[PDB]
Every structure is written in C-alpha cells, then in structure tokens.
Amino acid sequence: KKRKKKVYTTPKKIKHKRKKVKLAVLKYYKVDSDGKIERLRRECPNESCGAGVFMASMQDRQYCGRCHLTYVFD
Amino acid sequence: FIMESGAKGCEVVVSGKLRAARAKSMKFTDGFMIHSGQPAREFIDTATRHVLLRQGVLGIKVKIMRGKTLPDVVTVIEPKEETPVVQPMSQD
Amino acid sequence: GDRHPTRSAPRSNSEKQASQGWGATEGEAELKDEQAAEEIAQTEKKEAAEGEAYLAKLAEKKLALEQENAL
RNA sequence: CCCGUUCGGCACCUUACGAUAAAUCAAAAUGUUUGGGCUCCUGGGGGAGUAUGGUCGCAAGGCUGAAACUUAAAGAAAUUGACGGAAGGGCACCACCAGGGGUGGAGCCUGCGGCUUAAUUUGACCAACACGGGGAAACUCACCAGGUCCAGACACGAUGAGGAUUGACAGAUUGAGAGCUCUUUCUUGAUUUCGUGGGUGGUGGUGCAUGGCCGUUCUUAGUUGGUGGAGUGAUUUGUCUGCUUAAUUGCGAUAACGAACGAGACCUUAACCUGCUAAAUAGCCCGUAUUGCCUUGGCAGUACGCCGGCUUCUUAGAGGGACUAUCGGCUCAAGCCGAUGGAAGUUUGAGGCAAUAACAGGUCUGUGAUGCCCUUAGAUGUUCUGGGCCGCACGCGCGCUACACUGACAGAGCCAGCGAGUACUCCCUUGGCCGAGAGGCCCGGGUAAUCUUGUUAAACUCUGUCGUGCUGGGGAUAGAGCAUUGCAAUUAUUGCUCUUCAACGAGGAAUCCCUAGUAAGCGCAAGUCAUCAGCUUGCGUUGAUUACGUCCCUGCCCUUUGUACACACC
RNA sequence: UCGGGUCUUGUAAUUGGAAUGAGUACAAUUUAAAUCCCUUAACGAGGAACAAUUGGAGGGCAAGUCUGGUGCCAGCAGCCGC
C-alpha cells in the first residue's frame, strides 16, 4: 500500500482571467452633434435577437454573441 | 414494568461499549420464554434499535411474550358428580 | 498469538470508571436502584392508565386579474 | 485343635457425647465453665544457617550465631473452572469395518502462492483458495499515464452596477469541437469572487475501539429455580450403579419431591380417498357433420355443443386415515426383532425454526449504521480517453473431456418434471417467405392452467458401417473464410464453414463421498445476462454391490484423578 | 375542591423594637512606685464591619453518580488505589 510521492511536472494551469474593460459601451455610438444618433456596426440575422446585436468584424470572419452566425465575408 | 402491565414473560439484552476499552453485554430475564417452534414465531414480539453516544454506539434488543393455546399443554375436564339410586322407579 | 500481546495502545480501560458508566457492582446501590425503579414505574403507568380511560385561496389563482394598457 | 475369662503388646473397623480452619483424631478428647508434674523449640517473608568471634576435627566440616538493607504479602486446608504427553465409559460413514464411485497420472477451464511489470487494486490461510453471490472488453474499479468541474453550506471584512460575477465564433493547442489554455471582443448581471472562520464527502486506516449480521463450538444433548437433607462457609444432592432409546428419550434404584428451557410437540412438503364441494383457462361419455379401410353392425381420426350427462384420471378446499394395529419367542419393565393385514410399520420420507455460554472467528469494500485518525481544490471528491486485474521458467485446490467392442460411427422408432415471459420498451416467440450453416424479411399470439409448450430434452430402443491397429477411440495447438450481440471484438466474446490430429492404455507414496428410488449416468429450467457455464441453486430419466455393526485409527462429551494455572498451557 | 381557624419552623421579601462589651476614657482603688484585674462619668453595630479558621467529600470514615482544565504527563495517596 502506502501513498507514493507525486510530481505534477507541468508548472501550473492558469484560468482565462478577464482583462479589464472600463465602460467600452460608450465607444459603441457616434452622435451627430445634438441631432440624430446613427449607429456603428450593423446587425445580423435576428430570428431570436435584434437589440444591441453587434458583429465581431475583425478579419474576414464574424459571429453573433448568441446566434453564433459564422459568416465568411472576405 | 412490562409484567406489571400483565405479561407472561420478557427479556431485555443490551450490549456495546461506552466507557471501557472492550465491549460488555448484560442480559436480564424473568418469567417464561419459548424459543424453538412456530409458537415462538407468533407469540413473541421483538424489536431492535441503535443509539449513538459521545463515545460510540449501543445496541438494544427487547423481546416480549404475551399470554390460541400452546399445543404441548393438555387440559382435562373435571368429572361430573353423580349419585347411585335404588333399582326400581316409575314415571308418567 | 491473538490474545496475550495486545497490538493497540492501552487507552483508559478503567473498570472503576466503567462501574459508573454501567452499574456499580455493590449490593447497597442496587436497593436504591430498585427504589428508583419503583418510583419511575408508577409515573409511566399512571399516564397510560389516565389515557386508557379570511378566504384567500381564490386569490392564489387570481393573479392574472391585474391588467395594463393595451399595446 | 475347639470354646471362654484375664494381664501385657504391634495394629484395624463403625460412631461422635468431644475437638479443629479443614484434611481428619480413642487422642490431635476431658480448655473463655481456661491451673496433675517436668524439659526443649518458634514470633511476617527475604538477607541467612551468611559475616565475625569461640570451640572440636588430619581434611571435608560439625556446634554456637548476628547486623546493615529490602518488601505487602509469602503460607495452610478446602470449592468451582481450565488444562494434562493420566485412567474408565459412550456417540458418529465430515470414524472404521463390507463395498461402490472417485482425486493424486495427461490436456483444458478456473482460484491461490510466487515471478515480472508504470500499474498488474483488494478481503481470507477442519471453520481460507468454482468464496466476497467477483462468468471485469468501457462502465463496475478501489490501480497506472493523462485532462476537466465544484455541487467549498453559512457568518464576518472588501472589491461592485462611473459594472462583483457567467457563457462564447474563429485561428492556434491536445486523443479529443474539452473555450483546458493562448490571439481579438460580444453577450448575461448582483447569484457570485478574495481572505478569515466553519462545514461537506471519501471502496482512505483501524473488525485488536463498536452496532447489526453470519460462521464455529454444535446435530451433539445439554442447562436451571422452589421446598427439603449435608457443610461454620464457598458449595453440594436432586442432575444416579444398571437397562433401553436418535436424545438428561424413558424404566428403575435411591435423602429427595414436584417443576422450567432445550429435544419432542410445532409448521411446510411427498405419498391414500370411485366418499363431500367443484371446474370450456381440465377432462370423459353422448349427439350432429365428415375422412380412410374392411365392409359389419366396426375400427382409426377431424369440427362443433357453453342449461346434454358426469368428475374416475388433472387441479384445490374441508376432513378422514397409522396409533406400531393383531400375532409368535425374549423380558420385572421400558423395549427389540419377526410374520399377517394395510397406500403407508427406520421419528412413514425430506426440510424450517432451534437452549445457558463463549471466539480478540469474519465483515468499516452493503448501508445517509457508527468513534477516532487522515485527506481536502497540484483532491484520496466526482467525471472523460487508454490500459489491468487474463501479464509467466514453477508448487497447490474445486471441476470438464478421454484412455474404447459393456465401444465409435450412419439411418430410423420416441418418452418428463421444476420454472420463465413485453410500458413507456423492445420479453417468450408460433406461422409464411429467403438462406448450405450460422442468420435475414413479412403478418400474428400471449402481461398468461388460454400463447410460447405435449417445451417430441438427453439417455434409450431396432436395422447397418467400421474391427485390437493409440485405428473411424481422443480432441489440445493453429491457418483461411462467412455472421450475430454490442459505441467499440486486436490480447482472437461467441457461433457457423474447410483444413491442421498434440499428450493420454486405468494412473506411485497418499487420500475423499456415500446406506434405497440412495450412489452413479444423463440431460433440462432459474441466478448473474445485450453475448459468453466447464459455476451454483432447483427438476426429472435409468437404476445397482455391500451392512443392519464395533471402538482398532481419527474426532467429540461424561465420570474418576493431578495442578505452584484463574488474562486460565498462547 | 383554588375554603376557614387553632400550635411550631424557615423565608436572595418589607419593615418594628429593646441590650451590650471588644475597644476607648474623666475619677478613685490596686502597688515599695507603677501595670493588669474588680467599680465607673463622657464615647463605642447595620454591612464592602468590630468580616473565624484548620483539614476533607471512592472504602476504612461523616459528607456531591456537580462544572471548566489536563490526558499513564503534571500530580495525589499512612493502606487498598486514582
């Protein structure tokens, strides 16, 4: 029997800690100097959504936060 | 107290360990008690319970015999008295 | 041999304290024990001897009563 | 030589009016009611008959003879147990006689030891080892190499909606579409996170800390109050010389009499009922239609009857029946044996439950039964991938197949019983069709004396082939191919098809089980089960040789006996 | 029947009454001279005072199967023992 020694060779596994975001929602508009307020990023197919739905336009590939709309735009 | 309530016999056994290194058991008895056959299956009522104490666990066992009659016993009816009479007689 | 050379640690196998734990093995105490048994027996027996001889339920369902402006 | 009296000796038997703690004693009496006369010796156990002095002796030694110091018990007589390499009685096919069938010989299945491996998880040494209901492909699983998650309750202090806290596409990254992590930013929002305290869980340790349960002592016959007798007392007789029985089951003798548990009685099941109550989910007779042959008028079959008649057979309820009944020789008796009658004459056959009291018996790996210790977020918690428990020079145990003619092989004739079966699931399966074989497709019945099922089982019986040769007896080892169960078959699950054709000629020293529908042979159902039985629990078919005993061996209990043991020969 | 009266006792309840020396101090007495004692003017008791201790509570041996701490340690116990 007995409890033998253990050496977990891998140093440590560290979780995905959330990088700080300090009110990044105010960046999401463009106000027309005390008039109408046009929007920035356009919407998606919203069969089950429609409000505030932004599209991760980074490099030729996008998705929706809930709908997961994988669309290759190129 | 059982037999004050009118019981034909009883037996209580206690065992376990509470304040000693080894286990100790006691058994107290009085009256009559049958053990072998199906009369013993039905006449006796038994029960068993645990109890937990600061130091361990104690086991209690209780048996009670309530006194339609045992097959072994035999009862003889008292003979009825009668008297001899004179040989002649007559009636209506 | 499983008997003479105990293989555990001697830990408070005091028969004197056990006597208190179980029952003192003296004649004098037993008489007092019998007196106490007589005292306890009677009280249990006598108890056996004496013994032997604003509607709102609709409102629960009624929650959809409240209504709000149309459209 | 015989009978008797007396004096003086060596002794003995019964008894206690007497004595003592008792064993016992005609003195060990005439002693708390204490005095016939005289001499010697001891004052808890060791140190110690030692040291020193004196004295006798050729010497060995003899006679006289302390203290310091240490200790709470040493010792006598008797009682109950335990133990004995002591004796006497009894019981038992887990003992033997008289025998039957076997194992230990070979091959294989399977458990243990050991060896080896990263791991080969672990419990147990008559009463362990085909046991843990343990026939593990994952799961089970407690082990190894790896990877995730928290379900870390509640209370306190702080971050915090000028955002505590959650999830995620793609690319990389890993067996792995695990957001496990890394590149970038969308979404949810006070339940969470940090630290402190405090809990929860654990097939983690301790069965030598426990409960509960089971096994063994022990299938044997043993264990106790009341009144009385003996002893100052613990205790003892009752509970026994003898005979008998499976039995402390009985008869008897008796300082004992009358009783209580255990055994017996009790309950389940197997055998009998032409007598009762019966039954289309069981049968027979009878009546219609109808088939074949002899023809005759019948025989052998098919379908129907549901107020046609009945319950012998089948089946379940109430009862009855065997009690040793009658006999013939033993004998006080209890009984035993033998013949007749009868379905039944070993307690009619077989089981269930089962006394006082114990064991350092087994189980913490059954339990949300349970103390303490240990671990807790790089988990001993839970979960996913792969492996292993099966790895093998060799020792041992429970089984399976054979060594053939009392057999093998090929046709044909053909008889059971106990049981089991489908709802949110996939059971038992008939019939029709395809298929060499294993299998496949399509209707259907049965939640059941209704369907599977008359379960047409195996053994067995008749007619032939083979013919003493390890040959057509034997089937280990391997190659190729075809299917089924399952997510997955490699270390082959199993089945089917063709080929390959090992050892083994009745098994040494040793040793087991068993007394009549029994041993033995042969198969069938159920348990685990999706598949896998060489395993266990039950069922039926065929069906014998030898005995109605003893204490010689191996166990066990009762009496007498011994003890410096009583935690009791460990 | 939670009822009424007659005697005794106690009161984590209230008060109400009288008394006295432990000390202290005018006088005289005591004595070779003093002190103490025996008398006696003026003072002297209501709570934390004018406040009693030494050994014990398993048996011999009288008196708790209290409550916190320690865990064959510290210790106690003439003896048996904890």
Looking at residue A51, the DSSP 8-state letter turns out to be: S
The closest CB to that of C11, out of B4, B18, B21, belongs to: B21
Question: Parallel, antiparallel, or unpaired for β A61-62 and A71-72?
Answer: antiparallel
Q: Which residues, including other chains, have CB under 8 Å from residue B44's CB and lie 6 or more apart?
A: B33, B34, B63, B64, B65
The closest CB to that of B4, out of C20, C22, C41, belongs to: C41
Please, which contacts does B62-66 make with residues 24 or more away whose CB atoms are closer than 8 Å?
B62/B10, B62/B11, B62/B12, B62/B13, B63/B10, B63/B11, B63/B12, B63/B33, B64/B2, B64/B7, B64/B10, B65/B7, B65/B8, B65/B9, B65/B10, B65/B31, B65/B32, B65/B33, B65/B34, B66/B7, B66/B8
Give the residue carrying structure tokens 């003296």: C26
Token reading at A5: 């020694």
Distance from CA of C42 to the nearest CA of B (A): 9
Give the three-class secondary structure for A52: coil
- The sign one gets for the Cα dihedral B40, B42, B45, B46 is positive
CA A63, A72, A50: angle at the middle one, nearest 5?
Answer: 35
Chains touching B by CB (3 or more pairs below 8 Å): C
DSSP-assigned letters across all residues of C1-69: --SSS--S------HHHHHHHS----HHHHHHHHHHHHHHHHHHHHHHHHHH----HHHHHTTTT----
Interatomic CA distance for residues B62 and B48, integer angstroms: 7
Q: Is the CB of A23 under 7 A from strand D?
A: yes
Distance C42 CA to D323 C1' (A): 55
Q: How far is CA A15 from CA A18, A21, B47, C27, in A?
A: 9, 18, 58, 74
What is the resolution in angstroms? 3.0
Token reading at B54: 């600061």
CB contact at 8 A, B33 and B65? yes
Please, which contacts does B38-41 make with residues 24 or more away whose CB atoms are closer than 8 Å?
B39/B70, B39/B71
Strand residues in A1-74 grouped as ranges (E): 29-31, 37-39, 61-62, 71-72
